[PDB]
Amino acid sequence: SMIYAAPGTPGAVVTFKPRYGNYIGGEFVPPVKGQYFTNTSPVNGQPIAEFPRSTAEDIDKALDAAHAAAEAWGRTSVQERSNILLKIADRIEQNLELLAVTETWDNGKAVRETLNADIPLAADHFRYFAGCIRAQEGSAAEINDSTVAYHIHEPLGVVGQIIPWNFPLLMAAWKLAPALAAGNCVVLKPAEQTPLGICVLLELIGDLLPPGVLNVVQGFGREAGEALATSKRIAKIAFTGSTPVGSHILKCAAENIIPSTVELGGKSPNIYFEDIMQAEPAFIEKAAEGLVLAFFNQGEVCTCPSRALVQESIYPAFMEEVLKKVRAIKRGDPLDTETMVGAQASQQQYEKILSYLDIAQQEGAELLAGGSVEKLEGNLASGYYIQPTLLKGHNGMRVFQEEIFGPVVGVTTFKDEAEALAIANDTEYGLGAGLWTRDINRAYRMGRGIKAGRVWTNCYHLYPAHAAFGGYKKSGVGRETHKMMLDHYQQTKNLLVSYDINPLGFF
Amino acid sequence: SMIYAAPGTPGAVVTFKPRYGNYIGGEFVPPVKGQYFTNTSPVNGQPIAEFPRSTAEDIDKALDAAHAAAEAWGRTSVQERSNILLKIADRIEQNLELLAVTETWDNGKAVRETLNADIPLAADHFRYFAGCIRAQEGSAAEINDSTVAYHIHEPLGVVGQIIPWNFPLLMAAWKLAPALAAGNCVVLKPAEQTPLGICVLLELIGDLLPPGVLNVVQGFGREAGEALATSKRIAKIAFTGSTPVGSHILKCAAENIIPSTVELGGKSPNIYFEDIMQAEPAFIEKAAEGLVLAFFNQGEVCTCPSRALVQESIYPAFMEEVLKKVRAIKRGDPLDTETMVGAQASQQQYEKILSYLDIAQQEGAELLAGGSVEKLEGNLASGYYIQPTLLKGHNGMRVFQEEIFGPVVGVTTFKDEAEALAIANDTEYGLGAGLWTRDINRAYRMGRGIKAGRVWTNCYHLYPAHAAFGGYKKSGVGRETHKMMLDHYQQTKNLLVSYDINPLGFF
């Protein structure tokens, strides 16, 4: 351990400003209408700072800033843009404790996740895409002796990006790094629940970017987010969040015939076949861990393994390993590295999950662990903490069908491979899934039989760069965290060149 | 010279059936409601045959067939699917004369276009995509010693495709070849203006595919096309046609969160710099051809170069070579190989273009050639023929801005390169462009300066496989005629496999 002092107290690593503006054209400026909202820490509900309640007039200032710099930025050489993303990565590493403490206070999640996952993965994402842009190549092929097709990657120009609250800085990196590597200017709209981290990041890296290349407008999704999603001045929209707003985003994109990438929600089935109980005892632990991992980021993960599928024959013996670890979760101060499960992100998310616990009970869901509030002492009492919940039921329940987006896992049993496949795909989502078995053939079949974008095999919650992350079905369109991302933030210009100086006989 | 006899006459290569059904589950079937519309030849206005006026009940029957065959088809090995497409291509070559005459009779375009471009290019698309599926590879990268990322291309399953009338069979190949190569079953809705070609193609090639793999539903866009475009049972929609309907496809696709690709319309600028007048006499002539090439397929091409941009200094001398060819256009029987410009596709198309000529005169657009009907003798009088029109005006006119989709070219002058590029990009479209210059550096600048998906340089109207074809701006989303499409007809399955046992210390 290490127990970081609360921000702005003696020994604190960071003290936040009382008021933050938007970042437009290389500067922090007030909103046009001078309107502000108050943000609060979910760790304890105490005030943090105010941030602009920006209106459509602020989007257009950033769009003016982005467009002015678009021509020069898209022209900056591959080497130079890459080096800039390398400089951003270093800046992220150098301030690991400051960034993680800011994220944890803003988001509420345990600090040990921000130190070991969010911030290091964020730095690497800039490292990864700076690297991939040096290797990217267009194509040149001979159609014949006198006809050559050339394909040249070109940036789209100005792109709108809206990121959610459950990984504010890491979701920013998921989108800023490839779009910037591709030579685009960005208008970025952070979640009104978690605006603080991006501001602190911009204070650290702003000088590394040309003016107007990265503009960040704070505000609300139905104000700033709406003005951004319908902007006729963006060449592409990108959105991560809840399915109803995504469906709308794709409609906003449809009206203007612009590319769109949307990553939405999921109901991830975590599948444990019977042979795992016959593996080494250490493997058994990793699998039981892989189920408790559903409480990672307090279950506020779009690929949260919120559906546990365990084969009947091993269910009695396996859950006994799972429950040993569920009871071992240390709760408490999120700035305490020992705390394994932090606060829910907001009061709205906290209340939404509590309504879902009650809904589980009316459908006969048997409570196996948790199921209510966790009343932590001290300043924590005003925070938003819920107990890790393990529920046993059947896939046809509402709690097995709808994304809760909290530390709640449904458990059910299955008989054979075919039914395991049937329960896994009997969802409208298809973002993630877990699969635990040692039969090489079973691992492959289920791996391809499941209709999910990612199948973690004998692990869970690994989000490395260089692995495509995206949804089937209603889970979304497009892939992230992989070099294929670059094709989403660029268009292919085909130069079809004839070197013959005579006509083709049509005249 | 050679004059193919009209279908059903002595010596004709083809005699059409009086009534055709849909093709579903390996059979030709009537519509459920037994309702038919009459198809007529645009060469002469005379009836051809009756075709199903299919309703949503016909859309859903074919979707029932596609899903039944979806699992077995998607599992067929790369080798087997490839070989099947090679046999389809051969079947098209073996019947080159028969199908091309069908195209000409159904669509109206000159036979020499169906013989020398459309039909061979369709055959090559199947040869091309059979080839690209043999080369396709997923990815395999080690994230570390015990973490390996796999990406596996997987077919989307059942896909809807809707094609227009201006290249009935060739647009069929543009969509059928990659989707079938990718392992999808297809429900295809052809333009009710040109239903005949698909049927004749299916009578020749249907047997090569398992029942329910290729299903074609004939009907009207707002009836059958609507039922298909809004189907909950397709994993992707694919559509080529008019821009307002494209946005709607993108709306309906948004409703169900499915990937979408749309080719839309264009107003393609053909730019002629002054140095061409200093090249060899053969180059000059090829350039004059490239402007007259706008009358290819009667100007009924989404990338038709209907906007000619000529540098002021050479305008008088260049246009006289261009005018030399415009006057030399042979007209007559579309089945006459010597006939260079055929009939418009429909009566609505014939009158829609005439409405734009009326508008052109009232806007001060100066007539340099054509401008009225093409009054052909014999039975051709009941056909739909319009004169090749060269108009002089300025880019701000309506005829220079809006898609006419006919044998109409606007001609304008410019002073310098900067003005040439500015006029080139003063359009809402971005499908195609032409560029004529011998300065290697000027060719590159404008080549990347134009905001169109394709810039033909010192050529025009080459549509080879292995060259990306797709739109900027309101011209569309996605690319065609290139192997990069396969990712539009497949989904990436990421298997993230850990080979380390024991737990990772979390939870």
The label of the residue with tokens 């080159």 reads B96
Cα of A413 to nearest chain B Cα, Å: 23
Burial label, B97 (beta-carbon count in 10 A; 0-12, 13-18, 19+): middle
What tokens does A54 get?
Answer: 């920006």
Nearest to A204 by CA among A59, A89, A335: A89
Q: Rounded CA gap, B335 and A160, in Å?
A: 52
Distance of CA B383 to the CA centre of its chain: 23
Residue A11 — left, alpha, or beta (φ > 0 → left; ψ -120 to 50 → alpha)? left
CA-based R_g, chain B, Å: 24
Angle between helices A78-94 and A119-135 (to 10 degrees): 170
**Residue A150: half-sphere exposure toward Cβ, Cα within 13 Å:** 13
CATH for A352: 3.40.309.10
In whole angstroms, give the CA distance from residue B463 to residue B481. Answer: 8
Q: Cα separations (Å) of A269 from A8, A410, B445?
A: 42, 9, 52
**B349 shares its domain with B238:** no
**Structure-token pair, residue B170:** 């060739």
A316 within a domain of the structure (yes/no): yes
Amino acid at B208: L
> Beta partners for B392?
B366, B411
CA dihedral B369, B373, B378, B379 (to 10 degrees): 130
Tokens at A498, concatenated: 């004839």
* Closest by CA position to A353, among listed A396, A387, A394: A387
Record: contact B502-A283, CB cut-off 8 A: yes
Angle at A403 between CA A399 and CA A406, to 5 degrees: 90
Inter-chain touch B458–A498, beta carbons under 8 Å: yes
Instruction: Answer whether residue B10 is part of any domain.
Output: no
Q: What is the dihedral of CA A242, A243, A249, A255, to 10 degrees?
A: -170
CA distance A113 to A298: 10
Task: Return d(Cα B55, Cα B225) in angstroms, integer.
Answer: 9
Asked if B154 and B114 count as a contact pair (C-beta separation under 8 A), the reply is no
Q: How many structural domains is chain B composed of?
A: 2
d(CA A455, CA B189): 35
To the query of whether residue B419 is one of the catalytic residues in this protein, the response is: no
Closest to A350 (Cα-Cα) out of A367, A326, A324, A375? A375
Question: Left, alpha or beta for A138 (phi > 0: left; psi -120 to 50: alpha)?
Answer: beta
Kindly list the distances between the CA atom of residue A95 and the CA atoms of A117, A405, B54, in Å, as whole numbers in the listed order: 14, 29, 65
Please report which residue ranges of B271-412 form alpha helices under DSSP H. Answer: 281-292, 315-327, 347-362, 398-401
Quick one: A242 and A378 in the same domain? no
Taking the C-alpha atoms of residue B425 and residue B408, their distance in angstroms, rounded to an integer, is: 19
Q: Is residue A115 part of a domain?
A: yes
Task: Give the C-alpha separation, A73 to A183, whole Å.
Answer: 6
* Same domain as A279, residue A212: no
Query: CA distances (Å), B310 to each of B277, B394, B419, B435, in order?
Result: 11, 12, 11, 10
Any bridge partners for residue B261, and if so which? Answer: B238
Q: What are phi and psi of A320, to 5 degrees?
A: -65, -30
Distances (CA, A) of A255 to A259, B245, B289, B345, B474: 11, 11, 38, 29, 10
Across the interface, do B282 and A250 touch by the CB < 8 Å criterion? no
Q: Which active-site residues of A does the annotation give? A: 263
Considering CB atoms only, which of B152, B468, B484 is closest to A448?
B152
Cα-based torsion angle of the residue sequence A303, A307, A311, A316 in order, rounded to the nearest 10 degrees: 120
The answer to whether residues A306 and A451 belong to one domain is: yes
In our burial notation (b when 16+ CB lie closer than 10 A, e otherwise), range B460-499 reads bbbbbbbbbbbbbbbbbbbbbbbbbbbbbbbbbbbbbbbe
- Beta-bridge mates of residue A161: A188, A238
Other residues' Cβ atoms within 10 Å of the Cβ of residue A120: 16
For residue B236, give Cα distances in angstroms to B435, B475, B491.
Answer: 35, 19, 11
Instruction: Give contacts of A453 with chain B, Cβ < 8 Å.
Output: 491-494
To one decimal, the resolution in angstroms is: 2.4
A476: helix, coil or strand?
A: strand
Phi, psi dihedral angles at B219 (to 5 degrees): 160, -165
Helix (H) or strand (E) holding A219: none
Distance CA(A144)–CA(A226), nearest Å, equals 49
What is the separation of C-alpha B21 from the centre of its chain, rounded to a whole number of angstroms? 24
Q: Could you give the CA distance from residue A213 to residue A203 in angstroms, rounded to a whole number?
A: 15
Q: What are phi and psi of B341, to 5 degrees?
A: -135, 120
Q: Are A114 and A457 in contact (CB under 8 A)?
A: no
Rounded CA separation A37/A32 (Å): 14
**DSSP assignment, residue A117?**
I
- Non-local (6+) Cβ contacts of B348 within 8 A are none
Q: Do residues B344 and B42 touch, judged by C-beta distance below 8 A?
A: yes
Provide the residue type at A65 as one letter: A
Does the CB of B420 have a partner CB in chain A at under 8 Å? no
Q: Can you count the helices (H) and strands (E) in chain A?
A: 15, 20
What SS3 class is residue A315?
Answer: helix
Token digits for B368? Answer: 């340099």
A221 alpha-carbon distance from chain centroid: 17
> Within this chain, do residues B209 and B300 fall inside the same structural domain, yes or no?
no
- Based on the number of CB atoms within 10 Å of its own CB, is A154 exposed (0-12), middle (13-18) or buried (19 or more)? middle
Rounded to an integer, what distance in angstroms lies between the CA atom of residue B15 and that of residue A389?
72
Q: Which of A56, A36, A63, A19 is nearest to A215 (CA)?
A: A63
Q: Could you tell me if B132 lies within 8 Å of chain A, comparing CB atoms?
A: no
**Nearest C-alpha neighbor of B21 from the set B61, B78, B72:** B61
Rounded to the nearest 5 degrees, what angle is found at the Cα of A398, between the Cα atoms of A396 and A400? 65
Residue B229: name the closest of B249, B243, B201, B245 by CA.
B249
Q: How far is CA B289 from the centre of its chain?
A: 22
Helices B168-181 and B196-205, axial angle in degrees (round to 10): 50
Annotated ligand binding at A8? The verdict is no
**Is B154 within 8 Å of A448 when comparing Cβ atoms?**
yes
B chain contacts of residue A454, beta-carbon cutoff 8 Å: 494-496
CATH number of the domain to which B232 belongs: 3.40.605.10
- A14 and A200 in contact (C-beta within 8 Å)? yes
Q: With contacts defined as CB-CB under 8 Å, which chain A residues touch B507?
A: 289, 292-293, 295-296, 325, 328-329, 340
CA gyration radius for chain A? Answer: 24
Phi/psi of residue B187, each to 5°? -105, 115
CB contact at 8 A, B151 and B492 = yes
Answer whether B147 touches A (CB < 8 Å). yes
For residue A313, what are the domain limits?
Answer: 269-457
* Burial of A502: CB neighbours in 10 Å, binned 0-12, 13-18, 19+: middle
Using CA atoms of A504, B1, B6, B7 in order, give the dihedral in degrees to the nearest 10.
Answer: -70
Q: Say if residue A109 is in the same domain as residue A248.
A: yes
Q: Look up tokens 């040096």; give the residue.
A: A134
Which residue do the tokens 């199921």 mark?
A371
CB < 8 Å from A in window 367-386 of B: none
B402 found inside a domain: yes
Residues A344 and A476 in one domain: no
Chain centroid offset of residue A418 CA: 32
**Partners of residue A367 on adjacent β-strands:** A391
Residue A47 lies in a domain: yes
Nearest by Cα to B428 from B392, B458, B452, B405: B452
Residue type, B441: N
CB contact under 8 A, B147 and A459: yes
Q: Is A302 annotated as a binding residue?
A: yes
Residues B207 and B344 in one domain: no
The beta-carbon neighbor of A466 closest among B149, B258, B499 is B149
Query: Counting Cβ atoms within 10 Å, is residue B145 exposed (0-12), middle (13-18) or buried (19+)?
Result: exposed
Q: Tell me how many degrees the CA angle A350-A355-A357 measures, rounded to the nearest 5.
A: 95
Cα angle for residues B182, B496, A309 (degrees, 5° grid) = 100
User: Residue A38 — φ and ψ, nearest 5°?
Assistant: -95, 130
User: What span, in angstroms and rounded, lies between the C-alpha atoms of A491 and A183?
Assistant: 11
Sequence-distant (6+) residues with CB within 8 A of B153 are B136, B138, B182, B486, B487, B490, B491, B492, B493
**Residue matched to tokens 């819920």:** A386
Give the contacts of B75 (CB within 8 A, at least 6 positions apart): B183
For residues A108 and A210, membership in a common domain is answered with: yes
What span, in angstroms and rounded, lies between the C-alpha atoms of B341 and B384?
12
Q: Can you list the positions of beta strands (E) in A190-258?
A: 214-216, 236-240
Residue B476 in contact with partner chain A when CB distance is under 8 A:
yes
Let me know whether A436 and A477 are in one domain: no
Distance CA A106, CA B217 (A): 55
CB contact under 8 A, A504 and B289: yes
Q: Return d(Cα B392, Cα B412) in angstroms, integer.
A: 6
Angle between helices B78-94 and B196-205 (to 10 degrees): 120
Centroid of chain to Cα B223: 22
Distance CA B226, CA B217 (A): 12
Rounded distance, CA A322 to CA B507, Å?
10
Q: How far apart are CA A167 and CA A114, in angstroms?
A: 9
Going by the DSSP 8-state scheme, the letter that residue A4 receives in this structure is: P
Whether the Cβ atoms of residue A454 and residue A464 lie closer than 8 Å to each other: no
Concatenating the DSSP letter of every residue in B386-407 gives B--EEEE--TTSHHHHS---SS
Strand partners for A38: A50
Specify whether B307 is located in the same domain as B320.
yes
A190 in a domain, yes or no? yes
Spatial contact of A357 and A389, defined as CB atoms under 8 Å apart: yes
> Phi and psi for B192 in degrees, rounded to 5?
-60, -15
SS3 A435: strand
- Residue B358, both tokens: 């009326």
| A392 close to A322: Cβ distance less than 8 angstroms | no
| Nearest chain B CA: its distance from A259 CA (Å) | 7
Q: Are strands B158-162 and B185-189 parallel, antiparallel or unpaired?
A: parallel
CB A433 within 8 A of CB A469: no
> In sequence order, what DSSP letters do the residues of B92-124 get, joined into one string?
HHHTHHHHHHHHHHHH---HHHIIIIIHHHHHH
Alpha helices (H) in B12-161, listed in sequence order: 56-75, 78-94, 96-107, 111-113, 119-135
Residue A428 marked as a ligand binder: no
Report phi then psi at A162, rounded to 5: -130, 125
* Nearest in space to B488 (alpha carbons), one of B472, B507, B473, B468: B468
CA–CA distance, A367 with A357 (Å, rounded to integer): 9
> At CA B334, angle to CA B241 and CA B324, rounded to 5?
90
Query: Is A259 a domain residue?
Result: yes
| Segment (H or E) for A349 | helix A347-362
Task: Write down the experimental method used for this entry.
Answer: X-ray
Asked if B462 lies within 8 A of A262 by C-beta distance, the reply is no
Distance of CA B280 to the CA centre of its chain: 34
Look at residues A218, A224, A182 and name the one whose alpha carbon lies nearest to residue A200. Answer: A218
Inside any domain, residue A10:
no
Amino acid at A349: Q
In three-state secondary structure terms, A444 is: helix
CB B489 within 8 A of CB B135: no
Amino acid at A34: G
What is the rounded CA–CA span in Å between residue A295 and residue A279?
A: 25
Q: Determine how many CB atoms are found less than 10 A away from the CB of residue B137.
A: 7
Does A208 share its domain with A232? yes
- Judge: A472–B491 Cβ closer than 8 Å, yes or no: yes
Cα B388 to Cα A390, A439, B284, B297: the distances in Å are 75, 70, 21, 12
Interatomic CA distance for residues A128 and B361, integer angstroms: 58
Residue B504: closest CA among A282, A273, A369: A282
Alpha helices in A36-118 (DSSP H): 56-75, 78-94, 96-107, 111-113
Residues facing B496 on adjacent strands = A456, B149
Evaluate whether B69 touches B211 at the Cβ level (below 8 Å). Answer: yes
- Are B247 and A251 in contact by the 8 Å Cβ rule? The answer is no
**Chain B residues touching A141 at Cβ < 8 A:** 466-467
CA B314 to chain centroid, in Å, comes to: 34
Whole-number Å distance between alpha carbons of B11 and A210: 72
**Among residues A274, A235, A225, which one has the least CA distance to residue A442?**
A274
Encoded amino acid at A269, one letter: P
